[PDB]
Amino acid sequence: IVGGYECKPYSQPHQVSLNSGYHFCGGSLVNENWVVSAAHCYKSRVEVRLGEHNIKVTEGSEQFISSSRVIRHPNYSSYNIDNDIMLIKLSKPATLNTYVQPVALPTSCAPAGTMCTVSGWGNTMSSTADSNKLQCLNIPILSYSDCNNSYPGMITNAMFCAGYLEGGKDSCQGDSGGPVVCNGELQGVVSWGYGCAEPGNPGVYAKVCIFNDWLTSTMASY
């Protein structure tokens, strides 16, 4: 997260770290058994680390749980990173407590101008902001006109832009898969951009509100 601040510990209790040797993507706990992340973060088995604030220190709050199933959206497209959403089923349910709490799925799509929070342990492009401690940033959703003007012909219905066209504040590498939460609902998943925090290149996010049908039917299993 570039241009943000260290989160109050456990203020984003849905935030998870996906780890396979080291932190490589974030995710969001949506109930005791399932995590939502980005489809490009796919690995066939991952360890999900919950209750984290500083990922390099054991603090006592952590739960580390292996995945049992990692399911990419059927229409994910790696060429253009379209439909970039994935579900991870935990091999055992998370214990919900002060440190670990799910985030609600959206009841409707949030309109442009809504203020949201994005968080993660990715690159901060700063000598003073430590990416091992969870960083937080407040970003507005941008209109489709601004988003498509920044990235001509690249923005699909499964994507939205959020951030600042002036640059300076953005998500960055190592934040993929993490939450964009707006008024207590998971509206976006960190997905892609041209660099990080560059003028005229706001971050692009997977639009969760159009995936409610697939998310809730898949979390039912078979």
């Binding site: 990173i81 590498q173 892609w192 951009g193």
Partner: peptide, 29 residues
């Protein structure tokens, strides 16, 4: 340069996803 925000170690551009390149520090960006 569509570059997904995943943290990925690289030695060459070909290690990275989409239009990410291997930056000097040994990671895609």
């Amino acid at each position: 340069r569509v570059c997904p925000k995943i943290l990925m170690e690289c030695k060459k551009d070909s290690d990275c996803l989409a239009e990410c390149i291997c930056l000097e520090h040994g990671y895609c960006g």
